[PDB]
């Protein structure tokens, strides 16, 4: 619906959508097209913004320019960040191990006042990484994402803390700039500036040049304030400048002239101290001043401070209604740091802009030196300019920094959520350990902005959110949510956007409104969201705003969970968390029961290939698709065939459209890794039965029918990348060549003469992937243990060849080995409702609870799980599934059945395998399914299988008897989860040990052991199993004689030698003797000894 | 081609350099102020070597980060004791994903046959060379590597009443570790007993358990005698049975025994 070429999904939508879900992956593209001077954003800003919208590069260059050596004799001013076309295609950039970037130019002039006038010119700095239409960067040939960072905005935060000593509340204010010193106001320490502990609040006022009568007039209301103005040794101005001079810095001779200039440099000067347009705007709107004032404002010099102290004074006075002279009237209350009106969102554009700023500041010093050392006039700024400190500042942002993450390519949705992410941790925010329990909890302002379901399950619970489907980021960097305006209980078709502080000042009504075509309210009063985001109930007189659509608040992953409202937030959270780890399958099929969001999410995610222009398909190949457009020119889209995605899974694409076929603009042509006819298809539709089955499903385990493993329905493709190189070490020079001296011939078979494996050769754990030689000894690349399968493709990056290569290394070789993972025992499965599980048992097709028509059910999920876990969703999802697969011509009635009184759009008939849409609030109702199961569907034979209640009488394949009561069978969408035995399973009898510690390693890659912790020792000692523990902590780990002696003794079949001398004790004895402590172990009686 | 060294080397080098200079200052006959300054700097260097960041500013090498002194290798959360001396990774040990194996007796468990084959790799070789299955120990070590049909009939003979210690981190109580008899099962999953999940606190929702192989006769014995599930039914806490019907078996036996009127026969 409203999408050209998609498989029509019949909808359980009770309410007609007034707005169409906006282009997903917006926050990346809008921000990045803001950062650089882009025409689309330019025109968007012309449509909604000021007459002259300044681009991020332009405004950082404006914030830098001009550079002077104080004097103002020599000047340098950059402008006009003009770009060319991109360096190469994305696929080529991923291929050649280079950065997908754009060459960057600036119109720079070197003004020289005393000498002759120098002209302007175009300066080239270097390549700047640009964002693809998939809203990602390709750094060093890997597809990296910049996640959006939640940070406390620059602005003025008022707070009230209850005193421990006295029974009197304390009002604390805290302003915080974009780049500068912290100013903070406190009631009685009075004011702190640049760690100047304890100063009277009036001093900084007096320093601004405020005479007594102006203190009495401005700060007349409230007590203490006047007593704080009174309480000071230096009442006079010059005295106060000397006082604050002495307080600011104890060292350096303090002069009155110097004090004023340093004060006015530290809190008035725009370059040294910087409060951004967000900060200026926030303090302006919160104080109420500069109402109808443009951008490009400066620091809070004086006029703000008066407003803040007045606001504080009124906050003490206890009267909300306030008006400041030369400012708009704002209400007086405490400011909440959790409220999203106060929490801004710094996005890719700004997060890059900061590093461009820091890099340009790093450049400004080098320029300031360069122009100082170089000759006057005869210098040339194009001639003398350092490129390093910016390219370094950018390269170092995408090199190792936490906010520049590897894109989650477990599927499209994983990517879409990864790019639509709100991170509270990292540089500029709060550290994971430092962050308290208050910051993590959801806040009523989160609604329709940050997902109050989706979050990681690890130590980052509530910290890393996901931005909500409909929410969009402002040029400022605030999270605006769309809503509908209502005039006197009559809703409008207009869509407005709210920043949160206005929504706080207004009343918002909920999306389940009694909606007729007119939209005039019939329900006398509706449930509404109050000023403090509290759930209230009011008549249409109070209601000014209403929720545009249901599922405002959900992320894309959260949105793609049908009957979410019947699930609990905890299991839903887990449902999303695991859904964005759901692996693509060799034959993906779209859910028979879903929401409409699956259709939309895939085509926006950008991993599917979309038809850029309206045309007719010219010819279809597996390699590429060529479309002949209306105009005459053709588009040839090249499909990435079996590309290793970042998280190890495959990114296989296929064409869906036929040769003789017309295709509209914005239509699905190719098939992504998790699309089948353009729809977010992660897992499969399987016939589930819900019951206990002979203890194989006990404690939320899952039972498979071998049919799945045989038919290859849940079979994935997993590609492990293996990288090795020939770097010229000081000894000689490394080589990638077939021939090694001390090897067998039979193992040197898969390799060709050059020393790489031939393409498609199946590898057993121990096989050679790259023949490499060290200066000759052998250091060849062998396939790691647990990994097997078919070699997709070999890449080579020769020193002689043009390819961009790391520093020192000559010839890089990467290997793609693909294992076709068949859903075996011990692999993780999960639904969409958080109902996880390990595959307890794969039954042979026949011994499987089967339908009266002879179809064996695929999975059996344990019943006891459901009421405990509190996620009945999966059962409604299951039920509807049966209605989805089993087509239903409802003999409606001569006067319509009650359940179908509020029946959705023409959803009375449905053919076999009818894929149904049910949104996460305006979806399929409780009793509807009771009507939907009561539906004739003679599956080949002239009989119904499932009853009115939705249960079926199953025959036990194993026993052969029928089950004594009818069990809840139905079709369920289940997801192949990434928590795989190829990741998790690990064994070690013996193996290769570490050099530093003398205990076995950790990890499957190095063939490590398994960690025997303290808590295991506690339990061993609780048993009192001295020998077991003392065997575990000596020969099994440490003792070098011990391990070889016990191996030798085991293989010989002799008594195990008594473990004598642990390495740990030697280490600690030697280490204690290194710190000059003489430690000697005495016996019960006699002389002491060394251990050996 | 890069060299990985220890910070100690820098500090010892400083100390020995300062010492060897001071020696030459004594040899030449330098003024007492120079010599005493050298002695002060030496004192500072040795002081820093024994404990860095103990007095004033610490010594920093690459990028203004303080070097780990000798006392730094015996202090802090990550020096010794808290991590290094208390917990470490071991041999003759594995870790897999757990699944319910409801066929099994309480003393029995199930092992993934490959994982098992790797976990008893010597004990199988011993029997494979003690029998005329492998001609020589090297050839046995090849045959176990190739995983040939002749080892599987032996692995039952080697695993016959040979206990293994199942442990789940975090180990919250004594019954958090339990010994079992490993049955050899196909697949990639550890088949846990449904009764020991109350003890282990282990839901089958992607949780993983470590297996350990006691080697010494004493360890093997103690595994069989103390920490065998069949022995540890009652809680150390109270003495209420923890290895008891739970979740499913409860509803099963409850339905089985519940006497309801108005029924057939």
């Amino acid at each position: 619906n409203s999408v050209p070429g998609a498989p029509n999904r019949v909808s359980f939508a009770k309410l007609r959508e007034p707005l169409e879900v906006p282009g997903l992956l917006d926050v990346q593209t809008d921000s990045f097209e803001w950062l650089v001077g882009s025409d689309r954003w330019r025109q968007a800003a012309i449509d909604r913004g000021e007459e002259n919208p300044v681009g991020g590069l332009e405004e950082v260059l404006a914030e830098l320019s001009p550079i002077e050596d104080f004097s103002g004799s020599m000047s340098l001013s950059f402008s006009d960040p003009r770009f060319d076309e991109v360096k190469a295609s994305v696929d080529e950039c991923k291929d050649k191990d280079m950065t997908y970037a754009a060459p960057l130019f600036v119109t720079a002039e070197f003004i020289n006042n005393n000498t002759g006038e120098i002209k302007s010119q175009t300066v080239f700095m270097g390549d700047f990484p640009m964002m693809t239409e998939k809203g990602t960067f390709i750094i060093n040939g890997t597809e990296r994402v910049v996640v959006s960072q939640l940070v406390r905005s620059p602005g003025v935060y008022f707070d009230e803390t209850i005193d421990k000593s006295t029974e009197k509340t304390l009002h604390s204010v805290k302003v915080i700039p974009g780049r500068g010193a912290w100013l903070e106001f406190d009631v009685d320490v009075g004011v702190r500036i640049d760690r100047k502990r304890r100063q009277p609040v009036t001093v900084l006022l007096k320093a601004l040049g405020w005479t007594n009568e102006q203190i009495v007039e401005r700060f007349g209301f409230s007590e203490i304030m006047m007593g704080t103005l009174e309480k000071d040794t230096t009442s006079g101005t010059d005295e106060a400048l000397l006082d604050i001079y002495r307080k600011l810095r104890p060292g350096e001779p303090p002069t009155k002239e110097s004090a004023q200039t340093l004060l006015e440099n530290l809190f008035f000067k725009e370059k040294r101290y910087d409060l951004a347009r967000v900060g200026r705007y926030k303090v302006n709107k919160k104080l109420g001043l500069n109402a109808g004032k443009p951008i490009t404002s400066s620091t809070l010099t004086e006029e703000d401070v008066v407003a803040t102290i007045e606001y504080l004074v009124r906050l003490h006075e206890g009267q909300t209604s306030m008006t400041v002279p030369g400012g708009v009237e704002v209400p007086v209350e405490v400011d909440d740091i959790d409220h999203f009106g106060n929490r801004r969102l710094r996005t890719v554009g700004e997060l890059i802009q900061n590093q461009i700023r820091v890099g340009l500041s790093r450049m400004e010093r080098v320029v300031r030196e360069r122009m100082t050392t170089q000759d006057v006039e005869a210098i040339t700024p194009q001639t003398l300019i350092n490129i390093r400190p910016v390219v370094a500042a950018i390269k170092e942002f995408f090199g190792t920094s936490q906010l520049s993450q590897f894109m989650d390519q477990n599927n499209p949705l994983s990517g879409l959520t990864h790019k639509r992410r709100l991170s509270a941790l990292g540089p500029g925010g709060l550290s994971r350990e430092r962050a308290g329990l208050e910051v993590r909890d959801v806040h009523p302002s989160h609604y329709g902005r940050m997902c109050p379901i989706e979050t990681p399950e690890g130590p980052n619970i509530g910290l890393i959110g996901s931005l909500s489907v409909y929410a969009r980021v402002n040029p400022f960097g605030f999270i605006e949510t769309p809503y509908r305006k209502v005039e006197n209980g009559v809703v409008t078709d207009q869509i407005d956007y709210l920043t949160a502080d206005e929504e706080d000042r207004h009343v918002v009504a909920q999306a389940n409104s009694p909606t007729d075509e007119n939209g005039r309210f019939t329900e006398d009063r509706v449930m509404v969201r109050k000023k403090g985001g509290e759930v209230e109930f009011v008549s249409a007189d109070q209601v000014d705003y209403m929720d545009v659509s249901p599922r405002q608040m959900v992320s894309v992953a959260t949105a793609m969970i049908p009957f979410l409202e019947h699930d609990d937030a905890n299991r839903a959270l887990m449902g999303a968390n695991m859904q964005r780890q759901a692996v693509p399958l060799v034959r993906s099929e779209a859910p028979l029961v879903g929401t409409g969001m699956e259709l939309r999410a895939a085509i926006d995610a950008g991993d599917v290939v979309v038809a850029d222009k309206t045309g007719v398909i010219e010819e279809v190949s597996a390699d590429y698709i060529t479309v002949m457009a209306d105009d005459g020119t053709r588009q040839s889209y090249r499909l990435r065939k079996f590309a290793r995605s970042n998280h190890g899974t495959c990114a296989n694409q296929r064409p869906i459209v036929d040769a003789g076929q017309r295709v509209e603009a914005g239509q699905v042509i190719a098939d992504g890794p998790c699309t089948q006819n353009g729809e977010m298809a992660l897992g499969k539709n399987l016939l589930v039965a819900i019951m206990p089955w002979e203890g194989h499903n006990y404690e939320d385990a899952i039972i498979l029918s071998n049919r799945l493993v045989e038919e290859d329905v849940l079979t994935s493709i997993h590609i492990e990348e293996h990288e090795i190189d020939a770097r010229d070490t000081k000894l000689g020079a490394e080589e990638i060549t077939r021939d090694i001296p001390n090897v067998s011939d039979e193992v040197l078979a898969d390799l060709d003469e050059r020393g790489i494996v031939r393409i498609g050769a199946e590898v057993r754990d121990g096989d050679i992937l790259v023949g490499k030689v060290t200066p000759v000894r052998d250091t060849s690349l062998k396939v790691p243990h647990g990994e097997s399968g078919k070699v997709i493709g070999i890449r080579v990056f020769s020193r002689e060849d043009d390819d961009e290569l790391p520093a020192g290394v000559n010839e890089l070789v990467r290997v793609y080995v693909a294992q076709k993972r068949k859903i075996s025992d011990g692999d993780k499965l999960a639904g969409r409702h958080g109902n996880k599980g390990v595959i307890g048992k794969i039954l042979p097709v026949e011994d499987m609870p089967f339908l009266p028509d002879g179809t064996p059910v695929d999975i059996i999920l344990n019943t006891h799980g459901v009421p405990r876990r509190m996620n009945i969703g999966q059962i409604l999802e299951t039920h509807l599934g049966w209605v989805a697969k089993a087509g239903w011509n409802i003999d409606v009635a001569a006067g319509v059945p009650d359940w179908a009184s509020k029946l959705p759009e023409e959803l009375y008939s449905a053919p076999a395998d009818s894929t149904v849409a049910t949104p996460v609030f305006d979806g399929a109702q409780e009793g509807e399914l009771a009507g939907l199961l009561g539906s004739t569907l003679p599956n080949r034979d002239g009989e119904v299988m499932v009853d009115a209640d939705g249960k079926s009488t199953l025959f036990d394949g194993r026993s052969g008897e029928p089950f004594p009561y009818p069990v809840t069978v139905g079709y369920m969408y289940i997801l192949k989860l990434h928590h795989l035995v190829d990741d998790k399973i690990h064994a070690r009898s013996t193996g290769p040990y570490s050099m530093i510690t003398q205990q076995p390693l950790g990890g499957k890659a190095q063939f490590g052991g398994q960690r025997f912790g303290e808590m295991e020792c506690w339990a061993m000692q609780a048993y009192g199993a001295a020998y077991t523990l003392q065997e575990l902590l000596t020969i099994k780990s440490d003792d070098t004689v011990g391990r070889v002696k016990v191996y030798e003794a085991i293989v010989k079949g002799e008594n195990i030698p008594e473990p004598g001398i642990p390495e740990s004790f030697k280490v600690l004895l030697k280490e204690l003797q290194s710190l000059c402590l003489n430690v000697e172990v005495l016996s019960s009686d006699g002389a002491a000894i060394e251990m050996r | 081609g890069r060299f990985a060294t220890s910070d100690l080397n820098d500090l010892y080098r400083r100390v020995i350099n300062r010492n060897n200079r001071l020696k030459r200052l004594i040899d030449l006959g330098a003024p007492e102020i120079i010599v005493n300054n050298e002695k002060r700097m030496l004192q500072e260097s040795v002081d820093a070597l024994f404990d860095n960041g103990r007095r004033g500013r610490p010594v920093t090498g690459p990028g203004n980060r303080p070097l780990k002194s000798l006392s730094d290798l015996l202090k802090g959360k990550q020096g010794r004791f808290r991590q290094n001396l208390l917990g470490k990774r071991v041999d003759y040990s594995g870790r897999s994903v757990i699944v319910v194996g409801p066929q099994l007796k309480l003393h029995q468990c199930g092992l993934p046959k490959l994982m098992a084959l790797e976990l008893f790799k010597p004990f199988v070789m011993k029997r494979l060379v003690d029998l005329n299955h492998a001609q020589n120990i090297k050839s046995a070590k090849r045959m176990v590597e190739r995983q040939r049909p002749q080892v599987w009939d032996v692995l039952e003979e080697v695993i016959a009443e040979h206990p293994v210690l199942l442990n789940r981190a975090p180990t919250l109580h004594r019954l958090g570790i339990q010994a079992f008899e490993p049955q050899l099962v196909e697949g990639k999953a550890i088949q846990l007993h449904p009764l020991v999940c109350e003890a282990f606190n282990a839901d089958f929702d992607g949780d993983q358990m470590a297996v350990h192989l006691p080697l010494s006769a004493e360890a093997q014995a103690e595994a069989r005698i103390l920490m065998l599930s069949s022995n540890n039914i009652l809680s150390p806490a109270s003495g209420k049975p923890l290895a008891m019907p739970r979740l499913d078996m409860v509803t099963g036996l409850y339905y089985l025994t519940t006497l309801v009127e108005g029924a057939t026969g």
Binding site: Q1021, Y1023, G1024, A1025, A1026, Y1027, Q1030 | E218, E222, L226
Partner: peptide
């Protein structure tokens, strides 16, 4: 020293009984 590590445990001489020896 706890459990099976006390001197009364770690030092135990287990001989086969005089009646069991001759019987073999």
């Amino acid at each position: 020293p706890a459990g099976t590590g006390i001197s009364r445990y770690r030092n135990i001489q287990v001989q086969p009984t005089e009646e069991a020896r001759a019987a073999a």
